[PDB]
Short mmCIF file of C-alpha atoms and ligand atoms in Angstrom, two decimals:
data_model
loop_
_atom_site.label_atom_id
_atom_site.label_comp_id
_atom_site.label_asym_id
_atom_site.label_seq_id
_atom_site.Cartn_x
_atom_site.Cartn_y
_atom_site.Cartn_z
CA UNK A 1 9.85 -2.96 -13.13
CA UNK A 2 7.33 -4.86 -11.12
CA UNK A 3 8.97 -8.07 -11.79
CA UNK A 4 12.72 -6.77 -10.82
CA UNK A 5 10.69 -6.10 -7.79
CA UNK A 6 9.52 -9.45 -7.09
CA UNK A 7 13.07 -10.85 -7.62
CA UNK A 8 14.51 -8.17 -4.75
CA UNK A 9 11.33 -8.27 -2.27
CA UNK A 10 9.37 -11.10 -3.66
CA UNK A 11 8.33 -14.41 -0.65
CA UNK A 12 9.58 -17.73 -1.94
CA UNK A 13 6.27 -19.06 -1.60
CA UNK A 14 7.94 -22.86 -2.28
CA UNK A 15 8.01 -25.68 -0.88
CA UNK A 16 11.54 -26.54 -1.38
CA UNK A 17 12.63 -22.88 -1.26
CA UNK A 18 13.88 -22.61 -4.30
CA UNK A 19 12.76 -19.48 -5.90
CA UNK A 20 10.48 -21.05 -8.64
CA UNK A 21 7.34 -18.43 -7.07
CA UNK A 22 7.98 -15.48 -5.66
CA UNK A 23 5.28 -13.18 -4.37
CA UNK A 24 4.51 -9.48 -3.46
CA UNK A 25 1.16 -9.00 -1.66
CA UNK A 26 0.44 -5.25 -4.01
CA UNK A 27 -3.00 -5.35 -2.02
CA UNK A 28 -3.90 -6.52 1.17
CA UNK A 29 -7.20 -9.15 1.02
CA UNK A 30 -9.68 -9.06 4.19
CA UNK A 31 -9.74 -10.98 7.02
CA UNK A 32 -7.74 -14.13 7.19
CA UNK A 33 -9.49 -16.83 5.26
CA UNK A 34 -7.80 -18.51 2.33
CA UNK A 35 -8.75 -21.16 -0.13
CA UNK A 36 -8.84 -25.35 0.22
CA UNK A 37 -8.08 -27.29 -1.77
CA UNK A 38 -11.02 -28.08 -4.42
CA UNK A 39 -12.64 -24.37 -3.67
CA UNK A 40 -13.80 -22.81 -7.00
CA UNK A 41 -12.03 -19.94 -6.96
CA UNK A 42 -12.85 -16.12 -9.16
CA UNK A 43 -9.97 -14.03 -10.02
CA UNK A 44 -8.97 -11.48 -12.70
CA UNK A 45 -5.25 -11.73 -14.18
CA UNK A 46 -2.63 -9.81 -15.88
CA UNK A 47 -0.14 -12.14 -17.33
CA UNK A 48 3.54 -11.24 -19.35
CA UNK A 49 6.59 -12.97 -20.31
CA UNK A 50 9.51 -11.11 -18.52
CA UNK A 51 12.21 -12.17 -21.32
CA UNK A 52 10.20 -12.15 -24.17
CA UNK A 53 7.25 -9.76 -25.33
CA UNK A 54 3.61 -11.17 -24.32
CA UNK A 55 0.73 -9.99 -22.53
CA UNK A 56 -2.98 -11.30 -22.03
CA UNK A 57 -5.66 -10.11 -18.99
CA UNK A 58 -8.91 -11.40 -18.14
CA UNK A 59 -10.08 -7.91 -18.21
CA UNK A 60 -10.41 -8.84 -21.97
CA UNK A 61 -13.94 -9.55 -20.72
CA UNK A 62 -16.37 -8.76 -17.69
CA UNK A 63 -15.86 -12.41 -16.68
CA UNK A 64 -13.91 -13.41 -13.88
CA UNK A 65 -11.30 -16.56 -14.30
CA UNK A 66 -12.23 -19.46 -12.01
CA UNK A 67 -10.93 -23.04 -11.38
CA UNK A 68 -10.97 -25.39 -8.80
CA UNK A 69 -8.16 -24.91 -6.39
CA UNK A 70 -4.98 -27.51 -6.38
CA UNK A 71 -6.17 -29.69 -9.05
CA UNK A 72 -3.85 -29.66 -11.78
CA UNK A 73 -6.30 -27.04 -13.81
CA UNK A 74 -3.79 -24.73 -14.05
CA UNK A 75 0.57 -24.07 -13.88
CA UNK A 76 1.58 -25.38 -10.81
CA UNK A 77 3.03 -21.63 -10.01
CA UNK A 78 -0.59 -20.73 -9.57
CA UNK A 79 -1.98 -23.79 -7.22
CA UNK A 80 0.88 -22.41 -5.16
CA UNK A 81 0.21 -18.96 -5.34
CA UNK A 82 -3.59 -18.52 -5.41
CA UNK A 83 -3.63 -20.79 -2.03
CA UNK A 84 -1.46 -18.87 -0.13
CA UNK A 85 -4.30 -15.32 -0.77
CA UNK A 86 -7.26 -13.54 0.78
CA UNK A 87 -10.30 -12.29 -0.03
CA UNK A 88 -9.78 -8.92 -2.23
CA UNK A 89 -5.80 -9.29 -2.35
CA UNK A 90 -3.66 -7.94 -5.32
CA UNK A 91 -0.07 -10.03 -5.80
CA UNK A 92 2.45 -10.46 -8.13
CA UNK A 93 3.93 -13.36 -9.22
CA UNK A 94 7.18 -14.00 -10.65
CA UNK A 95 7.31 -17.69 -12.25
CA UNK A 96 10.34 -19.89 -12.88
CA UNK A 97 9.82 -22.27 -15.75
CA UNK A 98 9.58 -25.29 -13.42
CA UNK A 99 6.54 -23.36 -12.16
CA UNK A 100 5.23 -22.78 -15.65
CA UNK A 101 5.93 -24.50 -18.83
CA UNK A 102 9.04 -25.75 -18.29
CA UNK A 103 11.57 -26.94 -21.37
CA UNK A 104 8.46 -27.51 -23.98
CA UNK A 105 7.36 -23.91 -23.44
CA UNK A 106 3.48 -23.62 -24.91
CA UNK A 107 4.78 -22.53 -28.59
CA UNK A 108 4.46 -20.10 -30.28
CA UNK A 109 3.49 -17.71 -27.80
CA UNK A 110 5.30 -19.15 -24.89
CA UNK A 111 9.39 -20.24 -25.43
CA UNK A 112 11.47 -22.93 -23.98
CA UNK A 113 12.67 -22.15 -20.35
CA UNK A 114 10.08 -19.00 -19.52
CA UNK A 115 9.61 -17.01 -16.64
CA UNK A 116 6.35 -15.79 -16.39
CA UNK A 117 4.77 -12.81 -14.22
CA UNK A 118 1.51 -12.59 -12.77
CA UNK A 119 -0.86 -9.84 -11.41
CA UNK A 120 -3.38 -11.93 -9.53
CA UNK A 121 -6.34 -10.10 -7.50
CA UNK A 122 -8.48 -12.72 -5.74
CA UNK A 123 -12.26 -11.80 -6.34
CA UNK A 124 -13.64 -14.39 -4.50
CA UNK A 125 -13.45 -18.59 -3.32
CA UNK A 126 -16.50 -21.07 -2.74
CA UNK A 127 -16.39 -24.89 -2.07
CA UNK A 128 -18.49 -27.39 -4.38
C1 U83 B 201 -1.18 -28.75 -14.48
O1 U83 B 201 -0.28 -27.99 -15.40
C2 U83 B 201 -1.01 -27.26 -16.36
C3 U83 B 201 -2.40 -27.09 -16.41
C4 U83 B 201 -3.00 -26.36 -17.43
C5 U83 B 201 -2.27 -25.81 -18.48
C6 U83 B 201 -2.91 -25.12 -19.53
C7 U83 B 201 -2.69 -23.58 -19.56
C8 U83 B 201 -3.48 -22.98 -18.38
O2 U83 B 201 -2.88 -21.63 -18.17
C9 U83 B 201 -2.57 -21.30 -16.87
O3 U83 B 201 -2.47 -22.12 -15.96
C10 U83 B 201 -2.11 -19.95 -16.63
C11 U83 B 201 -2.64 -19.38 -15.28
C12 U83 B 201 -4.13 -19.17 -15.46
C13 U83 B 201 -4.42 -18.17 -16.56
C14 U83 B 201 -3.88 -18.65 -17.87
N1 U83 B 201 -2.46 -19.03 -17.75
C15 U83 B 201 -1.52 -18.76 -18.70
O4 U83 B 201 -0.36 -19.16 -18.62
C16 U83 B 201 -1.80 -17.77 -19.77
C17 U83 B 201 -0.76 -16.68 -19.84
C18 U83 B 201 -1.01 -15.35 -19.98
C19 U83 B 201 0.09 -14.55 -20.08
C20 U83 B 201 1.22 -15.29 -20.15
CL1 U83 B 201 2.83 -14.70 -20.27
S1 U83 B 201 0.90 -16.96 -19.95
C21 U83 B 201 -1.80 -18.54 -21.13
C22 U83 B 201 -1.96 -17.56 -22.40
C23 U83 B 201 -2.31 -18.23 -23.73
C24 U83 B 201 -3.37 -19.35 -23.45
C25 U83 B 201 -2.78 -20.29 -22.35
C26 U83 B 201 -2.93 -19.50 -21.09
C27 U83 B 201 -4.88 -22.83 -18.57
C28 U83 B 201 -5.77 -23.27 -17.60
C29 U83 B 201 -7.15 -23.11 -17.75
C30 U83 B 201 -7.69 -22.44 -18.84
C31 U83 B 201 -6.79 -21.99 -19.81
O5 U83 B 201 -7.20 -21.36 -20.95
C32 U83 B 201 -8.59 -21.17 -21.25
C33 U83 B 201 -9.35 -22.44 -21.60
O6 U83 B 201 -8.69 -23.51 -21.87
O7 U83 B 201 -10.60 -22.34 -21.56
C34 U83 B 201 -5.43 -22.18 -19.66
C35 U83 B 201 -0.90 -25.99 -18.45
C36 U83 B 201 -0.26 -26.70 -17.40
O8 U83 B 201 1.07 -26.97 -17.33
C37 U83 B 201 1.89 -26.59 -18.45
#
């Protein structure tokens, strides 16, 4: 599946290279502008356990998911990985715990120790 695929071919995207975000560009973005830190940034999601069975998408409405960029607003897997994408790009993510929620999970619908997976696509980025 897509996130066997990000383990085989996925970019360590980490700092300290240790496999906690992995990424496959699914979509290639436009030019080569990507977001600062503090940009609002406009995405749509598809998100799933990979050991366990859960599944949400922003789809579930015509309104696109924004925060502001490398603020602690959201897992830390996704400060990493939304930084590091262009303009109109698809990726997948595939999320350690560390990256995530870690030991305390977000219970019930997330469990202690949870690797996540992501289908980001990158609408669009602004400053304040
Ligand atoms: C700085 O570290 C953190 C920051 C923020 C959080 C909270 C969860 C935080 O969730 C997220 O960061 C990730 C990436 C952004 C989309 C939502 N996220 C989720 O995990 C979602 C997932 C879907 C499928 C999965 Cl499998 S996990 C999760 C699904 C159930 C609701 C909690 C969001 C969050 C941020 C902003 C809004 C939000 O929900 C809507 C709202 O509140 O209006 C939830 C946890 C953090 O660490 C555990």
């Amino acid at each position: 599946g897509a996130p066997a695929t990000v383990t085989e071919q996925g970019e360590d995207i980490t700092s300290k290279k240790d496999r906690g975000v992995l990424k496959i560009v699914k979509r290639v973005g436009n030019g080569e502008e990507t977001p600062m830190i503090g940009d609002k940034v406009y995405v749509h999601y598809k998100g799933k356990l990979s050991n366990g069975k859960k599944f949400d998408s922003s789809h579930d409405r015509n309104e696109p998911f924004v925060f502001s960029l490398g603020k602690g607003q959201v897992i830390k897997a996704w400060d990493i990985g939304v930084a590091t994408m262009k303009k109109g790009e698809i990726a997948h993510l595939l999320i350690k715990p560390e990256y995530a929620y870690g030991s305390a999970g977000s219970l019930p619908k997330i469990p202690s120790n949870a690797t996540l997976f992501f289908e980001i696509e990158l609408l669009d980025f602004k400053g304040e």
